[PDB]
Chain length 480, copies 4
């Protein structure tokens, strides 16, 4: 051979010169190698994720160290179970070339390759989110992206959405605090955010929240430092993770759950299924489950990280979803996006395959790498291929009763938009954090927010906390 | 488990009932299994080939039984070489549901999995074709498909194109003869049609034609029988091949070449590179090469036959293309179609992979199943990955000299549109075949061909042969 | 200019000859016109529909001639309303090249371009269907397509599915009767099949069934005649419709509904929402609504018929869906398929556009022809773009109560699999139809159905009717 | 209506709440509006360009102010002709979220909507480029992107490619100089870079180079300032252009050509077709043509800028390509990329349409918005649709003669890799620019370039200029 091949394994002849009529002559159409190489180059790029385009990740293990079999029969969470996993970390709004150290929510997405199928826990570095109904999510995300005429991101539009959707106040307070700028992914926490269901061997159900506490400690950038890093190294977080693992400094997290019995879900004074609400640690203490460690870098970023497909719909026996409407919307959206972003057969790619046998009634489609040979193509066949036919109530379901409506959740006695961020600002933050909050928010509002949105923003922050709100308004008036 | 899985390997729970609020209630959005199954079902279908949508095939072997090393160094054609192969047979114009036994050219497409890469010989059941320049091919194919308003195939349009492009007369005569209706694919011949180049170890070049003679004998349907079969069994040819191989009746062909030394290409009195011309057997006798046998049915029609990608550009050392402009156009077109029909990474699918190592500078793209890990991504790297850099004349090239033109080929003394089909009609056909020709052509012309095309058609057939032409005109006038 | 252009409007120079180095020379890569023409040719074909690939259609009008405002406020069904419409007719199982006159269900899909949006009524030429839960639909359709190894359709697989799913007996009886072979689309009826909801101005709800009775009369082919036509003219139905309209023989149908008050849905002795059940005409008589006439052929089959996108989810005020689980599954599936088959922005294509203004929060995507300029990209904006925010019960909803289950419908006193087809066979069919039924079914069962499916089929037909069942079994034993 | 619609024009009902079973209940599958909105959101993103993903643009006019009819008959370049145009500016290597103010080549891509078709002049802010054969372009671009394992950009890989391809020295010197960091797009020049052909009414041919000189003056950032801006405003250039035009500060450029008669192309002592070479202004002075002004911002960035498709193959009468092999490779590559990035029918999108009538033989394809009705689908039709059939030499062609080779260009007496950048460094740069060059290059080489590439880089810079090379080596050794 000549040192390289075409896609058919024939000699390439040259990777440096095209086929021409004489050394100074024109290129010939039948330079097959040139055409193949250039056409493939022209198709190297694929749609990025929407949202969470900019991200990176690593492989690792999960080890369940404590006994939670009272609450779940899920195989990966039985004491002593070790499971291989993949993690991807990301920002939300920026595109795939955007700086890592912008102020944003960070994704914390996990795929566990369990003995009963792949389980995805697609979390964030925050326990809450901005909105309560998935119909609002495209609107929220577009408000965080670019203006339709100029292609510029816009503070005015962001605050327009947030102030018109005051359910956002809890997450906006968390985001505008110090946790909006994690120094590295190794120095941030992860959360499931939503309530999920755990189901034990007896079929008893629990509402759970997942918490992932970093063993490396929480660390932050200030606004100034993050801005400087965005200019110095747009890939600071990606580099940090890859370099840490490459030198054997394997980051770890402890996973712990809050656990609420099924029946208490009905009566708790805060809506347990409202994604804008945390569960007070005094009412529901953390119960330790196990240890997540990341210890292996990808060998191929594109094939293993870019093409990884996670979905909260990918539950395993012992785990279910919950009445959080946002979670139910996510159950649809992820696979739908992946069929477009990756392809019809994205589940067949190595990173997305489970470690257990698959017998699923999916056939054909573009780029079908795997097939079931001559096996029957339909359930209720007489040809020897099994199918599933469980009837009646599912183990991980609940119940519903009502007219078909488009409505907000029923408010419980403890439910409102501003009490939980008020507590964050007054009781959890210290004085240094309150100072940084005022400097962050006033900075954002001075970045082009106009009337009448600007005045609505003052009122929003005064609703969170009268003092801090007045300080923000003063800093903005001063800066004008 | 429950008898089947999702794509993540988790239990499916049911392949028969959707998740609802009570047994009579509505379906819930978070029925992930339902969504996955239905969305994949919605994407099972892919674009069919254009042309040659309707087809089937089988795997087999090629054994080179004679010594042709005087003419080619190609590994698969060295005496004693055995090579695994794939064949696909097809019609040209009909869509994927169309009857097998319509009058049409049949494709005879071969992929040889050689020790120096995959070699594709994408032939037809005819030694010639309808046009001489690839710019005309889309026009020809559209004339053979459906009218733009009604969606109906139309004899008028077909004859409009053919009579305006009298270069078509040779192939149209072959097609309207008995060979237009092969009884099965096992009972038809195959040809390369084009002149190809063979190159021996010393670098001497030959112009070759490939011929594949059926060991089962030539057999035909009449117009009436083929029409009846189109109604009784639209998949007659596909069934015939699959059933023959399944009962151990393995079809075979002998491959033989005509061989013309490079220099004789310049002086031969017929243009050797004109796809509308055969080479007289008296001037260039057949030289036997080897035996093609098909002996294994596909295990999965979609994955192995529907997704097979052949290209005449897929040559191997010892074989090249030729000055036939049609062949040079094909070198571009096939891979271009496959990137759309199958996907960017179609070369990675099992049926399309070679049996030899691949080191090619293609990266990423949608549905990338295989990757080169951390290997260098560019040629002239210092990272240990080889590349190709042969300079100067390629072993399988020729030469050119001229202004850039859009022009017909230079006519040689023996070149014209009507002499070779005249000989077919007068000397090769017997009286029974001439009778069937007249009944075929008059039938086609009575199927809706209008003035002024109808009169041009009479003249076309009189140009092929004055007598037969007059008989066709009489049969049409009688039928009117 | 030269007589034609490139896609940029520059002169094409030639549509007949490629750019070469001299008249006998090779083709140059920079023949842009050749590349553009050939690459577009290579992408002319698109995925066909699954199912209902083979079809055609026409434009027309709907005129509401009677007063049904007591039952619906829908604008197109107010007395005197005329609405432009599109109809597409089709078979179910065959691919886009398959003969029109195969035994099959026919689609009867209508799009009404109303003053309150496009309303699609995607019906069939039958009032019932084969299965009751949409999870079974992909399985059913695959059983009606091709075997995975050979690519052949298979009676064994079809009867395997049907006999394992005896809910199918009503539709299988209708299909195997004379209506399985309509002579033309103009000579067949259409039905909504499902129960839909109508809602009047006061907000009172009715369950309705749609019926479309041909003004041309019902006409059929026998098995023998349909088979012969499949061989003589694979496009017989398409040609028939196009030619009828072209000569001014405009086909018409009368639309009439059956109307059941909301509350009677709860108590009727047959499940009104079971797609395998008709509503007896004695209990619910037909109420005339209006006249459908088709009076205009497409000008471009591909652009107007092939790219037409219908969805039962496309309701308009005054019309809703129903507790039929099959209908709820369809509400998801059609748009999902269309995003793949046509594209992200299929709703922007002319045939799919409404005749009323659109203000929808959809942005960007591949091939975005229309855009909203600089308008706000999110709801709850302060930028002057309106959004929708109706809260509470929707006018076209119902109610549900229960645990989350995967279960069959609750059987009502009149519900079973075999009573309605029994009545069809014994009371509706005459002796000639019973004879044709026995000859149809025995023919199908002799076409390769094997034990143990063949014996299950005898029992199935005996369950429909003991006599006819015994006659089928005798005809099969005789034919063996 | 309710304030907004679905894609069918029916009322949306809500853009804020999904359809659920009671206010606290689960989401129903048949929430069509939710599905449509979310599925479209999931498909908003498309593949970015490769390269030149990050960019923006504006509309304007071109006015030809001088008489160049002695050299070209092209309609847009006749004296007094005004033409609407679109410009897009971009970086090369970064993705769509990447900072505008990275060191890079800038694209300067123009589309002129002329009276004889759309003419694209796809230039850069440099008159030269890095490589001479298009086979090397994918390799070059990948060396400028990310490592395959870590996903990080890498100086080592960049210098590995450049030092192994010393033809790169001219452009690398230009890029590492002050012009690598334009302060805004309004303050940079544009060039065609390649030699193009101009053809006058008599058919006489000229080799031309295009030059676009900014009326705003050349302005730069230092390394430090550009880095700071990357952190402060990743969209600085996009914002600058949009804001300038919005306040009526319309940027302008003067276009001038260098003009070489056809015959001098053969004998000039520098290869006129080598993309790494400029033509000395003393030998070929600039001849003024006209004025480019940008005076209108996009109304929709996605629809008008993101989906704009430019190709150097889009020539118009009076303009042709040239023997630059890089240009001939580009003639293929752009449309090929656009069929994937945008779609089969990208030429139909408003921004890509010409202002003149189109009669082109392209049909169907996904998302076909425009069609030719019932018009004939093939050239040489008797149906009244014209086609093109010019034969013989094309007006904008040249000639070739030789064997088929893969070879570098023949070196002319003045040709080498290092003389032109030597002159740039010694004669054009001043002392301040030489200082910045040394600080730029040493900075790049200290950013992770390893042996043996680092030593090859010292030699490369010493080949450009012995002194400056020694200064770079000293700065690197000092920094180590
Ligand atoms: C209704 C609300 C939401 C919708 C509709 C939604 C939808 C999406 C979609 C479509 C993607 C891209 C998927 C792909 O292309 O592979 C995505 C990614 C992601 N989402 Fe969500 N999302 C929602 C809320 C949330 C919440 C609440 C969290 C965290 C608790 C979250 C965390 C993420 C993460 C981490 C990713 C990136 C996953 C990865 O690394 O590939 N999202 N989301
Ligand atoms: C310039 C003329 C021609 C052009 C542009 C052309 C182009 C094409 C294209 C684009 C396909 C579909 C490829 C795919 O989707 O995989 C095809 C298939 C095919 N062509 Fe050609 N073709 C030409 C002439 C011919 C000739 C002369 C022959 C035979 C000697 C031939 C034999 C076939 C066969 C057998 C197939 C089907 C291959 C298979 O089974 O997959 N074509 N052609």
């Amino acid at each position: 051979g000549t040192g390289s091949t075409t896609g058919t394994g024939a000699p390439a002849v040259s990777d440096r010169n095209s086929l021409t009529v004489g050394p100074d002559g024109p290129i010939l159409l039948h330079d097959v190698h040139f055409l193949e190489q250039m056409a493939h180059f022209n198709r190297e790029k694929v749609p990025e994720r929407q949202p969470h385009a900019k991200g990176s990740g690593a492989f690792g293990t999960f080890e369940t160290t404590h006994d939670v079999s009272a609450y779940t029969k899920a195989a990966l969470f039985q004491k002593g179970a070790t499971t291989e996993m993949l993690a991807r970390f990301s920002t939300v709004a920026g595109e795939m070339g955007s700086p890592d150290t912008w102020r944003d929510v960070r994704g914390f997405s996990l795929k566990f390759y369990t003995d009963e199928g792949n389980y995805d826990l697609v979390g964030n570095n925050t326990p809450i989110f901005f909105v309560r109904d998935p119909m609002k999510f495209p609107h929220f995300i577009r408000s965080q992206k670019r203006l339709p005429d100029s292609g510029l991101r816009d503070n005015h539009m962001q605050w327009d959405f947030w102030t018109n959707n005051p359910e956002s106040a809890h997450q906006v307070t968390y985001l505008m605090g110090v946790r909006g700028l994690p120094r590295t992914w190794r120095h941030m926490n992860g959360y499931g955010s939503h309530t999920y269901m755990w189901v034990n061997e007896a079929g008893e159900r629990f509402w759970v929240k997942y918490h992932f506490h970093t063993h490396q400690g929480m660390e932050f950038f200030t606004n100034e430092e993050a801005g400087a890093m965005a200019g110095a190294d747009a890939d600071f977080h990606r580099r940090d993770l890859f370099d840490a693992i490459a030198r054997g400094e394997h980051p770890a997290w402890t996973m712990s759950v809050q656990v609420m019995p099924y029946e208490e879900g009905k009566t708790y004074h805060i809506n347990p299924f409202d994604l804008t609400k945390t569960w007070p640690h005094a009412d529901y203490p953390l119960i330790e489950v196990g240890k997540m460690t990341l210890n292996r870098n990808p060998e191929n970023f594109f094939a293993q990280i870019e093409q990884a497909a996670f979905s909260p719909g990918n539950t395993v026996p012992g785990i279910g979803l919950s009445p959080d409407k946002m979670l139910l919307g996510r159950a649809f959206a992820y696979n739908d996006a992946q069929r477009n972003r990756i392809g019809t057969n994205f589940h067949q790619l190595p990173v997305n395959q489970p470690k257990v046998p698959v017998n699923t009634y999916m056939f054909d489609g573009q780029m079908a790498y795997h097939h079931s040979g001559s096996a029957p193509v339909h359930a209720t066949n007489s040809g020897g291929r099994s199918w599933s036919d469980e009837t009646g109530a599912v183990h991980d379901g609940w119940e519903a009763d009502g007219d078909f409506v488009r409505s907000a959740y029923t408010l419980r006695p403890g439910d409102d938009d501003f009490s939980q961020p008020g507590k964050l600002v007054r009781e959890v933050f210290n004085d240094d954090e309150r100072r940084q909050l005022v400097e962050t928010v006033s900075g954002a509002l001075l970045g082009g927010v106009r009337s009448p949105v600007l005045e609505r923003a003052f009122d929003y922050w005064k609703s969170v906390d009268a003092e801090v709100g007045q300080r923000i308004e003063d800093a903005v008036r001063a800066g004008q």
